Amino acid sequence: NIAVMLGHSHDVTERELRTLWGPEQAAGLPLDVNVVALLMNRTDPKSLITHVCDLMSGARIHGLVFGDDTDQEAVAQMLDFISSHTFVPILGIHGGASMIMADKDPTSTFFQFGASIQQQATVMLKIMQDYDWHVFSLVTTIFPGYREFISFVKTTVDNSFVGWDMQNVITLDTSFEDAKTQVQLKKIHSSVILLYCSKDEAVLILSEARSLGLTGYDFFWIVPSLVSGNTELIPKEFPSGLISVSYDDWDYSLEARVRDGIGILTTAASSMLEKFSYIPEAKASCYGQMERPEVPMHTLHPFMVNVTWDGKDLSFTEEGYQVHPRLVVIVLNKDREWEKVGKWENHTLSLRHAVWPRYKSFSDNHLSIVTLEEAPFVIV
Amino acid sequence: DPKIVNIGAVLSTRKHEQMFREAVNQANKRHASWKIQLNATSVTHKPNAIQMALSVCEDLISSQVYAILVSHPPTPNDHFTPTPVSYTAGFYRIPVLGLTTRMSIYSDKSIHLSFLRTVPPYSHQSSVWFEMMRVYSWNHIILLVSDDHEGRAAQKRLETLLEERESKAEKVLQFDPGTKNVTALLMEAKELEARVIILSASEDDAATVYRAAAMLNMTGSGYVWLVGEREISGNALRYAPDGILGLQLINGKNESAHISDAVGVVAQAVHELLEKENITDPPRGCVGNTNIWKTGPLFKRVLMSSKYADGVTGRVEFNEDGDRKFANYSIMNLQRRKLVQVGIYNGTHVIPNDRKIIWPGGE
Secondary structure, three states: OEEEEEEOOOOOOOOEEEOOOOOOOOOOOOHHHHHEEOOOOOOHHHHHHHHHHHHHOOOOOEEEEEOOOOOHHHHHHHHHHHOOOOOEEEEOHHHHHHHHOOOOOOOOOEEOOOOHHHHHHHHHHHHHHHOOOOEOOOOOOOOOHHHHHHHHHHHHHHHHOOOOOEOOOOEEEOOOOOHHHHHHHHHHOOOEEEOOOOOOHHHHHHHHHHHOOOOOOOOEEEOOOOOOOOOOOOOOOOOOOOOEEEEEEOOHHHHHHHHHHHHHHHHHHHHHHHOOOOOOOOOOOOOOOOOOOOOOOOOOOOOOOOOEEEOOEEEEEEEEEOOOEEEEEEEEEOOOOOOOOOOOOOOOOOOOOOOOOOOOOOOOOOOOOOOOOOOEEEEO | EEEEEOOOOOOOOHHHHHHHHHHHHHHOOOOOOOOOOOOOOOOOOOHHHHHHHHHHHHHHHHHHHOEEEOOOOEEEEEEEEHHHHHHHHHHHHEEEEEOOOOOOOOOOOOOOOOEEEEOOOOOOHHHHHHHHHHOOOOOOOHHHHHOHHHHHHHHHHHHHHHOOOOOOOOOOOEEEEOOOOOOOHHHHHHHHOOOOOEOOOOOOHHHHHHOOOOOOOOOOOOOOOOOOOHOOOOOHHOOOOOOOEEEEEEEEEEEEOHHHHHHHHHHHHHHHHOOOOOOOOOOOOOOOOOOOOOOHHHHHHHHHHHEEOOOOOOOOOOOOOOOOOOOOOEEEEEOOOOOOEOOEEOOOOOEEEEOOOOOOOOO
């Protein structure tokens, strides 16, 4: 059972070496299972459908741990559709099957382990309050999820007692030529700016804003993912020192992600056998469908939501939210690269910088007072 | 000399396919014929989903289409009609049009990023709820919802409208979809200070709520009802107290007028767009190509702003989210069965008829 599909568009570090060990390890859940693997090429709907259907000829009680490398957004949705009308739980790992989609049909079973936008906003609020900035604006543009983004930000701001100063909400949606953009840009005067746009929109907004002067030596931009790509492909007009958060790929390698997926599948099978003592199959046919109604026999839905592995726990919930994602915070480097400061491991940030390095924006009274405790003059 | 373009896509039945062909031929005779031809194809529905996906990918491959019509099949109560098609055409940026698919999931643009529709979804039903209650001197509102997507969208729209007028609802009592007991929720709702129960359920759930409220002695003597378009059709109409205001859409079950309006607006947009810079032909094959074409979003943007005036359904125009603006609902009220028309709503334009309104009870 359990088949994994790949094909090494970029990382050719695979071959038969990937199909090594897995469920054997020290796991005490043995049965008639294997670690069957498969390689492929660039994905098109016809080719992808045919390949997954062909794999359904033998993957009777199996699953797929497919991963991609491109940036085509519809890949996740097509995976969701296949998972829906096949009853085969699957997961997503790299790139295309890594951007979490908002809603899924209930009669579906797959859980990509990315991170929700709300989680990003929570981590960003945590880091902002950690540096005690509080006052900030929320300039944005028109793009899907902007409304829920704004509402969640507002509700999270209001539901605490630390006193954030909420002002200067800008939601320009009228191209970038009229006076509304100009007055909206001129109105803001704070030092903490939070943006949310889509790639070229963000770069155009920043290119307009630099000409106003809001890109001085005492300003911050905390853009949420969006303009991050999957590499050091920052646009040349991105000045420097852009604060961002993103999913981790350097402290987590695919060789371990595949192992974690295999372990999750095996643990789910062990739980099902411990609770149902029998796991059926669904290898009737991929094609020639619409021949049978629903059959809730051994649905994986209740057997995965609270599953750990080797002590480490990464149990999911409802949507593809993994409760404990390995988000990492990065900054733009002087040499146009991404740094690595702090890692969201626990609810604590665990940052590395005691003070901010004051990154040079484009290509003064704070001093160091020193004293020690003594007498009723300085008290520790 | 003409250049060939191949709009045209899935319909319900063969008669509908022939009607589509005659409609496109009608759309050719007007204006241009010496530059553009736009002959059309067709293909019918299938039960199996994956077979439909393969068929629509064949359709994309063999013709290099520029748009897609996705009218719903004759077997009802599935809401599946446009989803698989959409996903395939979502891979690229070729827009698709819906014909009778009134549901709220498609209104999203982060998940169905290439979808248009010439029908308004249920959130606008919430909007008309608010308009009527605002000009009816009834500002209390106690709304019921099924814990699903469409209920959440309706409640969000209603509350968002209510915020501008600076008012507030009373309760958002929600119930699990497809459940069997709702007695506790009605009992909890009984002891309040509201009389304008507003519910947006889905068919059988609404029927069982009707039955429970009938048993619990909630009908009549004040506590006036309101109900959405689908809450009074089907089995729900069997179990119903007198006085409901089952708001519903005028000329929405028809599809002839919709096919006409769609082909008209698409042809207008295409003739407007081929005056531009170098436009690339759309991708074909389905097996040798994996890239989106550049002129997709530009085509959708052009299509969005388009005012087809002389149509069978009025000045069809598109709200920026991809829905249809300025519909016309008929506020059908019930009295001794055989729902009788009582007024007409046309967008901040609610106007009753000369008939007589009776409330639950009969006072």
